[PDB]
């Protein structure tokens, strides 16, 4: 299990709480969260999940 940081909490890097469309919802907050995990080994797992948008209001 690879862990990332958000304020006073730890969470799985591939599963940030902002999902889906982290950037579309809160662009400033998403980038701030990514900057806080730049040194973490699971940074690219967090970058992949945060910059992926598969919204609810979609068939596929």
């Amino acid at each position: 299990p690879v862990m990332c940081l958000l304020a006073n909490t730890t969470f799985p890097c591939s599963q940030p709480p902002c999902t889906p469309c982290c950037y579309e919802k809160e662009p400033e907050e998403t980038l701030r969260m990514l900057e806080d995990n730049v040194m973490r080994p699971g940074y690219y797992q967090l970058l992949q999940a945060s910059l992926t948008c598969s919204p609810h209001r979609q068939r596929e």
Partner: peptide, 12 residues
């Protein structure tokens, strides 16, 4: 599902 649509250019 567009779960494979990771686009770094949306942030840059």
């Amino acid at each position: 599902s567009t779960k494979d649509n990771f686009n770094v250019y949306k942030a840059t």
